[PDB]
Write a protein that binds this ligand. Structure first.
Ligand SMILES: O=C(Cn1cnc(NC(=O)c2ccc(Cl)s2)n1)Nc1ccc(-n2ccccc2=O)cc1F
Ligand SMILES: [Ca+2]
Ligand code: NA
Lengths: 233, 54
């Protein structure tokens, strides 16, 4: 996360972190239930083996509330491809269930029609993660969040040097130096409605981070709500 | 009522069904008797920040 703020205690409890063979975080996820994590399909190609940590806010400090869970099943969208970055979505089933507690709680899945008419039409959404603090920078040891404006699709297409499919949406700022970045990939974009947070996106890709004339690109979760339900059985 | 005005007074999901507004809630919540509010059924319902230490 470039700009934004450190996420306050208890305010980003659906954040998950995928942890690789160097023991380092390399992507985020979103807690959907005791057994299921939402992430980006492209994150699966960045580590051969990984686990999921929840309830962490500071990767250099053992708070006592953190837990690491092994992955039992990976459910990658069958239409994802690295050539298009389309369908950039996967669900993980964990070997052992999460115990919800301080800093560990699931985000809501919204009903599709209402999400389109009511969530996607909000001024802003919230993205979070432990990713880099500027484009060429290092990852944050502390969990950050950022309010990012929704950006209209026509503007999104014009700004992009790559094809924006209907399974993608832009959020963020034209020139203001605030954005997600590498390391946040796979993590939550949620939209607030009357003090309840609903999953609306997955951090997917960008041409750099916080570049002028470029936006953050997110997996459009509305397009995959039935797919997530089926993946979660 | 219309869902386009104050979300049909619904806490969460609103739909206009048989030409009439019906509210509903995510899993982990039960729709209240007043047919508008969403009541958590557990201490960690989806989409709530964990602000009260238990
Ligand atoms: O590979 C990188 C590396 N990189 C550098 N900077 C970044 N930024 C971020 O990940 C984010 C910024 C805001 C976000 Cl939201 S996610 N990725 N980025 C790209 C660029 C383009 C693409 N891409 C998109 C569509 C079709 C083909 C294709 O290759 C994918 C990337 F990962
Ligand atoms: Ca920690
Ligand atoms: Na920008």
């Amino acid at each position: 996360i470039v700009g934004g703020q450190e996420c306050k205690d208890g305010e980003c409890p659906w954040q998950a972190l995928l942890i690789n063979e160097e023991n380092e975080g390399f992507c985020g996820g979103t807690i959907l239930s005791e057994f299921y994590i939402l992430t980006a399909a492209h994150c699966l190609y960045q580590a051969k083996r990984f686990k999921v940590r929840v309830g962490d806010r500071n990767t250099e400090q053992e708070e006592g509330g953190e837990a690491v869970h092994e992955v039992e099943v990976v459910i990658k969208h069958n239409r994802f491809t690295k050539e298009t970055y389309d369908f950039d979505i996967a669900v993980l089933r964990l070997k052992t269930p999460i115990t919800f507690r301080m800093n560990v709680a699931p985000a809501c899945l919204p009903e599709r029609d209402w999400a389109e008419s009511t969530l996607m039409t909000q001024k802003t959404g919230i993205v979070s993660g432990f990713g880099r603090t500027h484009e060429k920078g290092e990852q944050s040891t502390r969990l950050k969040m950022l309010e990012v404006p929704y950006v209209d699709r026509n503007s999104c297409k014009l700004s992009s040097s790559f094809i924006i499919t209907q399974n993608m949406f832009c959020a963020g700022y034209d020139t203001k130096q605030e954005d997600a970045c590498q390391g946040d990939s796979g993590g939550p974009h949620v939209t607030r409605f009357k003090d309840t947070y609903f999953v609306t996106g997955i951090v997917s890709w960008g041409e750099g981070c916080a570049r002028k004339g470029k936006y953050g690109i997110y997996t459009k979760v509305t397009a995959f709500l039935k797919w997530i339900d089926r993946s979660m059985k | 009522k219309l869902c386009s005005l104050d979300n049909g007074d619904c806490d969460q999901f609103c739909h206009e069904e048989q030409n009439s507004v019906v509210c509903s809630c995510a899993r982990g919540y039960t729709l209240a008797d007043n047919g508008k509010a969403c009541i958590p059924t557990g201490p960690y319902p989806c989409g709530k920040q964990t602000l009260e230490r238990r």
